[PDB]
Amino acid sequence: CCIXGESPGXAPXNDYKCXKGRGPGGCY
């Protein structure tokens, strides 16, 4: 699912719990 498959990818810092990425609700 990595972020739920709504972002570029796992983005362990680009979205997944990172302010860089904003999908279902993943930021820093």
DSSP alpha helix (H) spans, the chain: none
Q: Measure the N-to-C terminal CA separation of the chain; round to a whole number of Å.
A: 18
DSSP string, 1-28: -GGGS-SSS--TTTTTT-TT--SSS---
- Cα–Cα distance measured from residue 6 to residue 25, given in angstroms and rounded to the nearest whole number: 10
Burial label for 26, CB within 10 Å (0-12, 13-18, 19+), is buried
Contacts of 24 (CB under 8 A, 6+ apart): 3, 4, 6
For the chain, breaks with the C atom over 2.5 A from the next N come after none
- Please provide residue 3's backbone torsions phi and psi, each rounded to the nearest 5 degrees: 70, -10
